[model samples]
Target: TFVDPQTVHEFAKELDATNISIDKVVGAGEFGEVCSGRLKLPSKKEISVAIKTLKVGYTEKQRRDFLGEASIMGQFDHPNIIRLEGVVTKSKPVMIVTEYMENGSLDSFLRKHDAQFTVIQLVGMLRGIASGMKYLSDMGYVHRDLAARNILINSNLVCKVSDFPIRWTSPEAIAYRKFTSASDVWSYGIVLWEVMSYGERPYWEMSNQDVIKAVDEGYRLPPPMDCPAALYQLMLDCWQKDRNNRPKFEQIVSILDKLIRNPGSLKIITSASNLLLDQS
Candidate 1:
């Protein structure tokens, strides 16, 4: 068999290569080249999509890895999660097709439009991410790699979890390689910091070992200037050392929903006293 039997079973339907037409290279992905393209679906309008290709002459391992990701993606179906159109494994240079996001990654999008989004707008984006994460968690899937850069945003600002780093990972994950949804929560806290700071690099030039040590010593990232106290508190909750203490993605979504409904809850900035405590 060219692929694992289970992986082939994961697909709802296999796409014909002729139905896909590449428009332009948009960006690179974890496995291979990513491009914007058109997908002509039967009985449906021709839709725009992003195509991920397994380069020709790929080793068997590469093909499996690429298709493995596609299989996992095909199982997911949520508005806040990136939608998989289909897979084309019957043809040469196998491909995974997914919906196109005009705004690209959340980190890059925020970096380009610094100071452009209001607090509520940022919360809305986070809400979408949390909702997506919750869906995956309920399915017993642990992302193990959730961060701002891995999150994609559409032109309408819907943020979807796409894909990590030592900086965003939890201490348990870094030390014992114990990855769980709780660990994903820890990374979500970093994403919150990234959003608040408009995509500023986490830890700001600290070496990876230093980041590890600092976190081990009970140090958490300080709230960004102008960050709301409620939101920063949520970050702290996510960063709790005991993984069980970390908020579940469902709870996080609920918390964000509350904040969105009452924007005034995000009005109180983190106290200067808290910042001083972190500095010393």
Candidate 2:
């Protein structure tokens, strides 16, 4: 809630309230209901967008908190990052409008289409995510939250990072409240595992306390069955105790791009023996 409303308002341009036409209630947001709507820009085709409205009777701080995400999102302009169409603050029922992804969140999408994508396609999705992170990193913004669920996929299977909703934590973050791009890399590693496993839950059925202790004791999640050795190695690299040893988002993007260009490089599959050995 450290965001200034005026700054967010300036960056996230105010859209004509008349140009937006709400369709149906899609989901719920942190502050109020979310809706699927069509936004008709002047001299442009109408585009579908997800809208989050600020309910009536809100305090100043609540309003600032509601629009805080817009402040961060309006600064980014990349294919892999979610696009902010505009905001509606001049009218009643304040709204934040963003481009809608047809396929929804990556984790749910993968779970629905389990075992459907080839390694190349999966890596392609990861590449898009890494590219987005690379952009964020270069902009000096560290994504404290990066997870498969936080990623969105369009109808064409192109992945994009969504709002900065904080969730995942890294070892360094837990130990000393340190949050950096390197910690984001650690979260990305978990996200990689989630993608490879076709949306399987990480730390499987373990309590938060148990998972933390296990991770602290050097227990990393094992490679998903049939995962590529190179990819798992990258995951391990991201999980390195020393944050400096972890690969940066730029390095991760390059690695994924290489794997995409040379599909054969992802052929050497991770073995059950390696998984067993890694499991404590």
Candidate 3:
């Protein structure tokens, strides 16, 4: 509590109320809401940005939580992670400014464009996500909430990881209330399911308790319709009961790269019989 929100700022650009002009409400959350805005700089230049704000009648905990994303976002400079343009900690609205994604969340974008992308094109998008996770995994960072809905898709269909600690967490993270690179690996498997299924729900209609119990019984999600067997196998590998057995992000990226380079290696599996034939 010794330092104010403004004083702790280092990597982020700090501005005031006059800088960011709200255009529209883009998103909302437990801690605060986000708005699409125009950030006017001192040089008379303006940039489209998403501004996160603290809600009215906020608690001290919420205030710290609101600034938390900016703190973490500033450290991420990779292309596959959303860019944090700056912050307005000292201003009335209190904002975390970041570049806006034109296409919105990856989940909605994929569902909207379902069956529209070729197998190779879909893998390319998944590759970007794995690449970003590799960066985070390398940094010893575990994204508590790694899902397609948590991923932002730019107009180019490039996926960028967003959201944090969705507080809902991973499988290992859920059962034991712990998080590790391996748990993030579990979440990545869910994301892969999301991509192949055109944003379909992982355990369609399964309640939270049911999902937890199902996972305990080794009931992994079935391969999506026409999902590539190789890709689906990778998803199964990520959901290994033993967290240690889950492929690291580094290995995940390499496997995806192979699929991308040798498109013939990607084989679609329409059913369990086809999946069995995959090994033949």
lDDT of 3 at 85: 83
lDDT of 2 by residue, 1-280 (tens): 1232368766688999988999989887778888888999888789899889997997888898888889888888899999988888888799999988989999999999889999999999999999999998888787787989899999989999996522257887987889889999999999999999898878767777866777777778888878999999998888887889899999999999889888998999987412222421
**Candidate 3 per-residue lDDT over residues 164-231, each given as its tens digit:** 43213466677777788888888898899889888886777666787677666666777787888899
Winning candidate number (lDDT): 2
Winning candidate number (TM-score): 2
What's the residue-level lDDT of 59 in candidate 2? 88
How well does model 1 score by local distance difference test?
Answer: 0.84
lDDT of 2: 0.85
Q: After superposition, how far is residue 95 of candidate 2 from its true place, in Å?
A: 0.3
Question: Which pairs of residues have clashing backbones in candidate 1?
Answer: none
Candidate 1: residue 226 lDDT (0-100): 91
What shift in Å separates residue 9 of candidate 1 from its native position after superposition?
A: 4.2
| Residue 252 displacement (Å), model 2 | 0.4
TM-score of each model, paired residue for residue:
0.92, 0.93, 0.87
**Candidate 1 lDDT by residue in tens digits, 1-280:** 1122355446636898888999999677666788988999997679999888988788888887777777777678899888888888777778888879999988988999898999999999999999998998887788888889889999899998875179999999999999988999999899998998888888888888988988888887888879999998998889888999889998999999999989999999998312112211
Worst 10 residues of 3 by lDDT: 271-280
